[PDB]
């Protein structure tokens, strides 16, 4: 409908950086620690992108200290602040759910460098 | 109701009595015959024998 | 009919 | 409860259903008018119209995508040469349904499904 599209397009931000799934994407997200407002960092590998317009989201899989940490992020949410692509991954599949079982040497992928 | 076998009797039944004596903690289990009363008398005789044995054992230890 | 079968056993109830 | 679903099952599995839609679409392209039941014609409206839509523009790869369906060279030969430049002006809706009584074998709703043709 035009009503739903008009209500969504007035809220979507117009400075979304375009990135393919597989890129080493570092996202800085706001967090409220009570009386503090800190911009924290989260650097990992994007394994899924669900485009839904305003409802769009993207996963950033990170291998932290110990086991892996998978965390989704809404694109047009005010809680996130910056999205910076570090490396350009050259996978040929939209979803990268097979990387969950792979740890260590088998987790890395190809660089585009086109 | 009782465990074991051979009759419906068993099924509609009860015919199994457990009596616990509270200040000592003595449990007497009787599943012998078909009737409760003839097991009631056996359960009270076993209660009397076990209480008398537990008291005389404490007296002989003292 | 020429052949009437044996009926179906019943509940045990023995 | 099939809320907002499409696609008629027609009491057949997807293999036989796709195969008979293939054969019936080929027969409708070859003969330009056929007589069948009514829901088969209703679903064949969703089969023949994408074939003509693919047959709107003649090229190299469009012949291979029109050969991927209907599995025949004479059907794709009648496509892109005879139906293509004749249905060029009209945009969509190239078919026509005619309800024609009932069949005497099983009392099913009969229908002539045809194209907008036969002015030869």
């Amino acid at each position: 409908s035009n009503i739903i599209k008009q209500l969504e397009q007035e809220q979507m931000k117009q400075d979304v950086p375009s990135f393919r799934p597989g890129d080493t994407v570092e996202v800085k997200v706001w967090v409220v620690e009570g009386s503090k407002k800190r911009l924290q960092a989260f650097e990992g590998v994007v394994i899924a992108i669900r485009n839904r317009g305003l409802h769009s989201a993207f996963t950033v899989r990170k291998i932290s200290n110990g086991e892996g940490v998978e965390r989704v992020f809404q694109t047009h949410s005010p809680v996130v602040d910056s999205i910076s692509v570090k490396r350009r991954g050259a996978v040929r599949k939209a979803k990268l759910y097979y990387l969950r079982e792979r740890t260590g040497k088998a987790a890395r992928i190809k660089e585009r460098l086109n | 109701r009782s465990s074991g076998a051979g009759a419906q009797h068993v099924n509609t039944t009860d015919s199994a009595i457990r009596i616990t004596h509270l200040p000592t903690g003595i449990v007497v289990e009787c599943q012998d015959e078909r009737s409760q009363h003839k097991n009631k008398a056996k359960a009270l005789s076993v209660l009397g024998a076990r209480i008398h044995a537990a008291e005389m054992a404490k007296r002989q230890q003292a | 009919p020429v052949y009437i079968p044996r009926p179906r056993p019943p509940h045990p109830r023995l | 409860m099939r809320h907002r679903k499409s696609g008629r099952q027609l009491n057949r599995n997807s293999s036989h259903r796709q195969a008979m839609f293939r054969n019936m679409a080929g027969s409708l392209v070859r003969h330009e008018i056929i007589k069948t039941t009514l829901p088969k014609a209703k679903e064949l409206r969703r089969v023949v119209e994408p074939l003509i839509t693919l047959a709107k523009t003649d090229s190299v790869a469009n012949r291979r995508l029109a050969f991927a369906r209907t599995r025949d060279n004479e059907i794709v030969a009648k496509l892109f040469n005879e139906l293509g430049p004749r249905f060029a002006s009209r945009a969509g809706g190239y078919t026509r349904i005619l309800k024609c009584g009932f069949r005497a074998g099983d009392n099913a709703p009969m229908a002539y499904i045809e194209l907008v043709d036969r002015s030869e």
């Binding site: - | - | - | 026509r96 005619l98 309800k99 024609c100 036969r118």
Partner: protein, 56 residues
């Protein structure tokens, strides 16, 4: 499944009271030929809305 007793002729009639078929009684007249046909159906000779739609 197995009944206690049989129903009546009256019970059978009150059951078959809703089994009465309904005729359409709405046969149309063609514009050109005037033959009898049903709603949204072609005639025996293929007439529909005056135009020869079957061409056969």
């Amino acid at each position: 499944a197995v009944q206690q007793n049989k129903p009546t002729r009256s019970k059978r009639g009150m059951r078959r009271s809703h089994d009465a078929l309904t005729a359409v009684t709405s046969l149309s007249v063609d514009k050109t030929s005037g033959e009898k046909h049903l709603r949204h159906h072609i005639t025996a000779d293929g007439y529909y809305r005056g135009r020869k739609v079957i061409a056969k």
